[PDB]
């Protein structure tokens, strides 16, 4: 008969050993640019809302002071 030992048609195809750890492109300083940007949004909006809340504050004190007598 023939022999049943293993090796097949040669090569088993290619195999990739070498190291790969790629792909993060979002990082220049521009990460700072987007974060600091987010701050620049927060202070804008929050500024507005605190102004509004002061307006309400004066209005409430007006309620009280009109009550006082």
């Amino acid at each position: 008969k023939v022999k049943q030992d293993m090796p097949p048609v040669g090569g088993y195809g290619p195999i990739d050993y070498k190291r790969n750890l790629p792909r993060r492109g979002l990082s220049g300083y521009s990460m700072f640019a987007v974060g600091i940007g987010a701050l620049l949004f927060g202070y804008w909006s929050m500024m507005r809302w605190n102004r509004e809340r002061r307006r309400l504050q004066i209005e409430d004190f007006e309620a009280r002071i009109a009550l006082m007598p």
Binding site: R24, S27, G28, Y29, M31, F32, G35
Partner: protein
């Protein structure tokens, strides 16, 4: 043959050290890389119920 690691020139030139202050400061590599490669969670774990299932063996 010798192929050695960690012998490299860290660039003190600009645009490298940008991402170095970003790197030390903002934890992007830590966060993105690790938290995400654990967020790799969803792959179906490998566990077998031993009373009702049994691992492979050989003749």
């Amino acid at each position: 043959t010798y192929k050695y690691v960690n012998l490299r020139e860290p660039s003190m030139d600009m645009k490298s050290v940008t991402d170095r202050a970003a790197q030390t400061l903002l934890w992007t590599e830590l966060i993105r890389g690790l938290g995400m490669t654990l967020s790799y969670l969803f792959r179906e774990p490998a566990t077998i119920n031993y009373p009702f299932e049994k691992g492979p063996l050989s003749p």
